Amino acid sequence: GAMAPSYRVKRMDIAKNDEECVVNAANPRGLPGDGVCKAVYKKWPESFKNSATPVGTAKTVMCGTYPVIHAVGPNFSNYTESEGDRELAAAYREVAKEVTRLGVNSVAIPLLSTGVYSGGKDRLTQSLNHLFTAMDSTDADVVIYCRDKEWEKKISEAIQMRT
Ligand SMILES: [Cl-]
Ligand SMILES: [Cl-]
Ligand SMILES: [Cl-]
């Protein structure tokens, strides 16, 4: 466990994190993919051996001793808002189980389904709240990654609101 479990946000490439494991914003087929998934493939390609897993689940594959937790959010181009919301909440609960099982003291996590899976919508709040629902009961230090300056400010504000 971390001494004083916390949330933080950083605006940078999650492939350059300083945490004990990474959550990939994976596709269901374990393909190199786009966005976060492509940066994770470049940095940890060994972790895509048998990484394919269904929507709403997470599958961990070791790169050396470094855990890559492949978390598959729904593509809101394909899902209804209602079923999409259910699967996005489920993917984060599976992330919390894996982070707990691994016994890490820190984890780097992106906002699932906010990129090319967002179906053209701003899902910062929806995705972040499902992240909190899942990770609040874990004692790992959580570091949320983003790339947009206005997203960094909104994520930071949401963290500070609860403190
Ligand atoms: Cl960066
Ligand atoms: Cl995405
Ligand atoms: Cl972003």
Residue-range domain boundaries for the chain: 1-163
The DSSP line for 124-138 is HHHHHHHHHHHHTT-
Q: Strand 7-11: give its sheet, edge to edge.
A: 7-11, 141-146, 106-110, 22-25, 66-71, 58-63
Nearest Cα neighbor of 40 from 130, 109, 102 is: 109
Looking from the CA of 74 toward its CB, the CA atoms found within 13 Å total 20
Task: Find the 4 Cα to ligand 2 centroid distance in Å.
Answer: 30
47-to-82, 103, 135 alpha-carbon distances in Å:
31, 19, 23
Structure's resolution in angstroms: 1.5
Helix (H) or strand (E) holding 20: none
Task: Find the 147 Cα to ligand 3 centroid distance in Å.
Answer: 4
User: Which residues fall in the annotated binding site for ADP-D-ribose?
Assistant: 13, 27, 35, 115-117
Alpha-carbon torsion angle 31, 152, 113, 20, nearest 10: 50
